[model samples]
Target: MEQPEPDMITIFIGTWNMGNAPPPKKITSWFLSKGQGKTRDDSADYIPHDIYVIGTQEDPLSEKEWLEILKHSLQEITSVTFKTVAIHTLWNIRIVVLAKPEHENRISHICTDNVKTGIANTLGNKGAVGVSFMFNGTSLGFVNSHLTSGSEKKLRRNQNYMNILRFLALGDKKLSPFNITHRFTHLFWFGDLNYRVDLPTWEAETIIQKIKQQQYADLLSHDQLLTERREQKVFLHFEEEEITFAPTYRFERLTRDKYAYTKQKATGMKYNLPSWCDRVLWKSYPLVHVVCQSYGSTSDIMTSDHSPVFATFEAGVTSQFQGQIEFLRCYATLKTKSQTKFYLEFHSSCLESFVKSQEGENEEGSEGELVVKFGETLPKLKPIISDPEYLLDQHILISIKSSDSDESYGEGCIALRLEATETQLPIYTPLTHHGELTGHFQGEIKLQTSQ
Candidate 1:
């Protein structure tokens, strides 16, 4: 039995820097963050998302300890049961996803990977943990990142974010070899991004004081992350909702949510001006519809120096997408057998992976000459057709040839469309090496397309 196509799922994403402290005994501030401490009960039984992704950095708890505490803490919820669907940790950075019981069959293709950018880029101490999966046939990606920290480390953190995007290659052959950001149809990246406000301690405190007096806006001007995004320096394609809450970092250790400043330290511990360090950003394919329900910081919890930032989204998946095709695999059969080593090659900006077939590893005969076998299944091919050159105008020129030789055994140029008939769908073309009729080869291009 198959479930109906799901629409409008509520996803809750939260990130916190645990300050190397174990989770609090009763951490209810995040779930009840919407409206707390008020006697008037106007809420209609507030229920959080069935799909929840919670991320942490500088956490002292082990994964075993963290999961048990998470399960224990979630038992107080009034709505649903929870289980960890995906979990990964790189040092103190932990990212876990919890979902309802009905998701036993609704989720598939789950993958988790981590990238380390700490201490000469060799330690897993500072980096990101990415989780990718398909929920009800819609691809979703989640990332928990803990970037380099320092008031003056804006550029370092910018590159830190890019390093995760550049090196997070999962084992799935169908996914992108690099860049976990673009591999999914929908993406949510939340963590202690560590982008500091480029303002003096006094100036930032004055702004925060003004904001606390009355709920307000206009404190984002000095944010390094926003400035980077505006100048197209980083996070070039992702989108983040406007932050309505106060800054989430540099709070006093055990105070009543007091913003820490350098002037008022009992010990030698230094403090930088508070900044909106915890952040949530998301982007998706055009076919998906994402609606931001809430984006704010949880002020009730003070166990950590940085407040937990959460964003709830009401999103849905469709049967199609805009401006890209997920290129799955390419199958080719060499038309002519050759003693010289040769392999198929595909080069196009349309493909992110540039579907180049791996060189043959066939054993040699006693003479030690390279033996190219006939009718053998070609090496794996994976790519994404991101360029929509007039839906039907996008074509890939695949050619087979010998190693380091310009001799072309065969040439096949096939046009990929949003809609293509499913069949053996053989594409045959004649071989030409310097315009001479050399031989012919048959091939097929496969795609996991949404129309």
Candidate 2:
């Protein structure tokens, strides 16, 4: 009874260097559409992604302030409410996650870590902050880094990356399903990587001019990060989509499509070359296939010297369930002397196959029926399948009882464990609970599966 594969999950990731500036009133131009020359609003209808991972560098506000701002802006843009799942920050770098309402329960086991590589190893100016969690049974990891800045420091940047891998370990107390680096079914690493082009300032400017004239191949050849990646050391396994947009760094503030070298007034040294410093990269395990649906920058919103970069992905994450049985009354109240009514909902095909495998179908005994137990005390229950053809609306009634008179007054817990009669194996669900009650015991229990 293998379960059918789940539908693809869409994820949207955006990274920006805020330059300590606050969010703008409208972010409509930040999100681009699937086609060229079209914004997200231009479509007849916009379908929001299931998950959003937003990373920011040089953010000045506190976590709470930024979260509220982001929440408001996202709702205004997409017209869909998003709940903040997790947030991680180290100094200037911050990463926040948002999820749709229906998908909230599927996320769990959240863990976070941060490492400082700045002066004296105490400053937060340069470091990486990460958040890892389980989503729908697949492990996912995201890292937002503000690596060591400046050109001709590629080796140092690589060292910062390796240092992050060495020092930042997540889920130390609880055993994590995935390793910090290799365990994530899907991994997203984005921020201001600060990898520059290995060309002279004038040469870089000439290439930029050529890029404006629709020439990009030669510039990428001189990209320091790409050249280093060919050596297969740091960032060897990560994949970055083609850079179709112009350079995302060293742009003149309040100017459109202009480099910032000529605008530099204080630095007497040579002007810094414009490069693609802000970047987005990803890695995934074999079980999870991640496709880059869109990759580009938000060139229209120019608040900082560096423009924002974003990428959207369609991921196929594998699940462990063959099929799932659901409960209608996920949460309910039980008493000592009354029969509690609840429902077990599932697909007809799965129900039929499950029941057919039982030993005795027509017998009045509990040999072939589903068994429900509360600790050592087995609740007296009768399952009523209205129709075998339509098994999803099946009902079950159980008479809950306190095992002891003394235990009836105080708080007590009951775990409604469901098991098949033949195999006696309990299905994987988060529904089993420690039902608590007080003073003649009134409490609630949730019956649901962990996706």
Residue 146's lDDT in candidate 2: 87
Query: Positional deviation of 417 in candidate 2, in angstroms?
Result: 32
Candidate 2 segments exceeding 4 Å error: 1-6, 33-45, 171-179, 262-270, 320-451
TM for candidate 2 is 0.66
Error of 1 at 90 (Å): 1.0
Once model 1 is optimally superposed onto the true structure by TM-score, how far is the C-alpha of residue 3 displaced, in angstroms? 5.3
Candidate 1's residue-wise lDDT over 1-451, tens digit each? 9956566688888898988866667775575444221211227235646688989999998788888777665667544668689999988898999887777677877889988887666544789998888776467899899998877788888878777876776434453222454455578988999888777755766866865764444567878889988876667557998777778887886654577757445524545676888999996653347877778776667788887777878887532223333322333344344656677666443456566665654445445433344343554333343333333334445566667664556544454543452223445444433223344445454443333
lDDT by residue (20-81, candidate 2, tens digit) is 77766655445443222112344522677888898999988899998887777678767888
List candidate 1 stretches off by more than 4 Å: 1-3, 35-48, 121-124, 176-178, 202-204, 214-216, 263-270, 318-451
lDDT (CA) for every model shown? Answer: 0.66, 0.60
- Give the clash count for model 2: 3
Error of 1 at 184 (Å): 0.4
Candidate 1 displacement at residue 424 in angstroms: 29
